[PDB]
Each structure stands twice: as structure tokens, then as C-alpha cells.
Design a protein around this ligand. Structure first.
Ligand SMILES: O=C(c1ccc(OCCN2CCCCC2)cc1)c1c(-c2ccc(O)cc2)sc2cc(O)ccc12
Ligand SMILES: O=C(c1ccc(OCCN2CCCCC2)cc1)c1c(-c2ccc(O)cc2)sc2cc(O)ccc12
Lengths: 228, 228
């Protein structure tokens, strides 16, 4: 039962180190673009487990829950960081400070331009809302905790997991409410802003689902990194 | 610029007629279960366009936006009504008053039991939150208006569509906030409840995505019904 400022301060401190990758500097189509992307993701996934372990309450979940949450929201988590990095750069996807792809460079891979457009539009919604860093922190932690687990346990086991996850999501909501109240907008505007940010969660989920199907059409040590 | 009570009163009045279908009364596996399901959905989709046209602001959207919203959220809309119908019936999916399938009867179709479990768990979250009818109305209207449109227009055209849709989603948020405030819970609990309901939107999106892929692995008159 800690405060919203504690929780947001732990989130800021848990932020992974920005992963530096460089363009291959020798333009490629499907081959090198994805190759660099795959190396970037893999570095980011190593830091994602370290960050997940610092989200308040996450390590008090069973390891079975921890593993399932991460297995279903890793791409959403990757995507929302890409969106935040690209927010102040209309038309480009800043995958890393030295790996900035423009919208039309997505024509090189197998139908990734419509996925890149989804990502740019979600990024524009964030820019339009003027998403603040602290709001972004709550939203990313909420993507991990509101993840769908699969496969499913019995209805009774699932309910126990849900109760717990719901208690942790409520602490993050309290912190986001608190972050929103510091802007001094009215009560009505504070609910609308809470709602605007939460509704983009369904868009991040949708893009992730597409991205995963898209990666899979072109193509287990979690615990080891988790218990360390 | 009408009131939240106006908007919720229009939602209640726009509710489609409950579609009655009966079990074939002669048990079948993959054949008849899906056959009945397909007829049920098709009747419901006819009423879904009539209901969409009554959501405040929907008909003031261009027909291109209207068509894209409905093309991407129809399964979510179907699913959330099924969830609401099944809410007070643990273990069963009430697809229609005379078409009540128990959890284990999903073993008859091609891997639909895990999809049926997703639906039952989302339904249990709703039951656990004690979802009220008026809250449900706002949530279903929000699924239609927060739908992803595809394919995407230019970044500029999309922004114009987003602004408009955002204005309509804010009117629905205002109405849900108002519905929530009538329970008399505290301010803190009201935000948490707003957030609990909005976070299940991402779960409805996810299940829809699965359901669509699942239907498609086993297997254009919108405007005509829209302009009438
Ligand atoms: O390009 C990638 C990407 C590429 C390969 C990936 O996975 C590598 C495989 N790896 C195998 C072992 C288990 C972990 C995943 C993941 C993301 C990224 C994205 C993407 C875009 C469109 C699409 O259709 C699919 C994905 S989004 C993104 C954000 C990042 O910060 C990093 C990479 C990315
Ligand atoms: O079984 C269906 C269902 C069956 C056929 C459907 O589509 C019929 C095809 N029709 C073709 C013309 C365009 C409109 C769709 C739709 C839903 C329903 C669902 C489902 C469940 C699991 C799964 O993997 C996929 C779908 S959920 C649902 C809720 C309803 O109220 C009615 C049917 C349903």
C-alpha cells in the first residue's frame, strides 16, 4: 500500500537503457532491414525482463503468471517504446537513435508498410494528446499487467490470478490519475484524458496482434533470466 | 452538445432486438454447431448496422469512415453482447435464449474451446466487476467508435477522422463517467472503475482478433443497409 508517487518513481528508475544500434549503412531490402530489427528486439527483450521484474507487485505473482504475461505482451511493450521514441518525429519510426526509418522505407520488407502506418498513426494519436513521459510510464506498465495469459487455467485458478492482477492494475491507475491531476485540468477533462490513454491500449494490442501474424508469415529461458 | 443522460437514453433505445434462434435439437459436431452460429451472427449483423446508425455522431461521419468502423469491430460487438448475455451464467455462453452452450460443448468444433475459454473468462471479469446495463451500453458504443479503420488514409486525412472520432468517444466517456458517478462510490473508486472497464476493451479486441483468425482457418452491401 505505497503511494502513487512511489510507484511512478519506481517506474522511472526501472526504465531500460536506450539500446543503440546503427544502420548497416549499406541499404538492403528484406534481408538487412529485418536482420537489424531482429537484433534490436533481442537486445530490448533482454532488458524487458529486467524491467518487468521491477514493476511493483510483478515478482509477487507466481512464476507461471510472470512467464505468461511476458509471453503475450512483449511485442506491445516493444511497440509502445518505439511509439514514444518516435512521438516528436512525424513520418519516421525511431527504432534506435541511429536507426531512424522513414515511412516509405517500409516498402523494402514484405507488406510491412501498412503495419508501419498503424504504428505511425498510433504514434500521431500520442503526439496529438501530447502524451507526457510519466503518463507513458503508467501506460507501459499497464500493458504488461493487463496482458492476456495463455493458455488459461481453470476458471477458479484464473479468478485468483485476475484478482491479484486487478489489484496491481488499480495501483497503476491510481498513479496515472495522480499524474493526470498534476496538469490542473478540470475534473471532466481528467476523466476524458484517462479514457483517451486507456482506449489506445486496445490499438496497441491490435497492432501487436498484426505484427505478430506478419512476422510469423515471413518465418524458453524466460525463467533463467527471471529468477536471476 | 447534448447531455450524458441524453446519450445513454439514446443508447438504451438503440439496443437491437434480442435474436431468437433454437438449437437444431439434433446434436452435431463441426457441421451444425457452426451452421446455427453462422445464422445467428448474420441475423445480428443485420441489426448491428441499424444500431450503429443510432449511435450519436456516427451518421455525421463520412460513409467511408462508417463502413471501415463496422468492418473492423463487428466481431468485438458480437462478442461483447454474448458476454453480457452470459454474464449471470457461469460456465455457459448464451448465444441466444434458446441456444445455450456449455463450456465443454466447444470440443465439437476445430479448436474453439480455448476461444470459448477466453470468452468465459472475459465474461467472468464482467461478472466480477458487476457490470451494470448502462455501463455495458457505453462500452459497446465505445467499441464501435474506437475501432481501428483499415486500410489507412493519409496521415492528414486520418488525423481529421481521429479528431472527430475522439470528439464522439469523449461524449461516450462523459456518459460512462456519469453512469459510474450514480453508484455513489468515491472519487478514487470511480477512476479505478472507469479504468477497469476500459482495460477490458483491449481483451475484447484480442479475443476478436483470435476469433477472426480461427474462423478464417476453417474457411459489401454495408452501404445499401447504411443509406436506407
Ligand atoms: O521489426 C520488429 C521486430 C523484428 C523481429 C522481432 O523478433 C525477433 C525474434 N525473437 C525470437 C526469440 C524470442 C523473441 C523474439 C521482433 C520485432 C519490430 C516491430 C515490428 C514491426 C512490424 C511488424 O510487422 C512486426 C514487428 S516493432 C519494433 C519495436 C522495437 O523497439 C524493436 C523492434 C520492432
Ligand atoms: O460463432 C460465431 C460466429 C460464427 C460465424 C460468423 O460469421 C458468419 C459469416 N458472415 C459472413 C458475411 C459477413 C458477416 C459474417 C460469426 C460469428 C460467434 C463467435 C465466435 C466464437 C469463437 C470463434 O473462434 C469465432 C467466433 S462469438 C459470437 C457471438 C454472437 O452473438 C454470435 C455468433 C458468435
Amino acid at each position: 500500500t505505497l503511494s502513487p508517487e512511489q510507484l511512478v518513481l519506481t517506474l522511472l528508475e526501472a526504465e531500460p537503457p536506450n539500446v543503440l544500434v546503427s544502420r548497416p549503412s549499406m541499404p538492403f531490402t528484406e534481408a538487412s532491414m529485418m536482420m537489424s530489427l531482429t537484433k534490436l528486439a533481442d537486445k530490448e527483450l533482454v532488458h524487458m525482463i529486467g524491467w518487468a521484474k521491477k514493476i511493483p507487485g510483478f515478482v509477487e505473482l507466481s512464476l507461471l503468471d510472470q512467464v505468461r504475461l511476458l509471453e503475450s505482451c512483449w511485442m506491445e511493450v516493444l511497440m509502445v517504446g518505439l511509439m514514444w521514441r518516435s512521438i516528436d518525429h512525424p513520418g519516421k519510426l525511431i527504432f534506435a537513435p541511429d536507426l531512424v526509418l522513414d515511412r516509405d522505407e517500409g516498402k523494402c520488407v514484405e507488406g510491412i508498410l501498412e503495419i508501419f502506418d498503424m504504428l505511425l498513426a498510433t504514434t500521431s494519436r500520442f503526439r496529438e494528446l501530447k502524451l507526457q513521459h510519466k503518463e507513458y510510464l503508467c501506460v507501459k506498465a499497464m500493458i504488461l499487467l493487463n496482458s492476456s495469459m495463455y493458455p488459461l487455467a481453470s476458471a477458479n485458478q484464473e479468478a485468483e490470478s485476475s484478482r491479484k492482477l486487478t489489484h496491481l492494475l488499480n495501483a497503476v491507475t491510481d498513479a496515472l490519475v495522480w499524474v493526470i491531476a498534476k496538469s490542473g485540468i478540470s475534473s471532466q477533462q481528467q476523466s476524458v484524458r484517462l479514457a483517451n490513454l486507456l482506449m489506445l491500449l486496445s490499438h496497441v494490442r491490435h497492432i501487436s496482434n498484426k505484427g505478430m501474424e506478419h512476422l510469423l508469415s515471413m518465418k524458453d529461458l524466460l525463467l533463467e533470466m527471471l529468477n536471476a
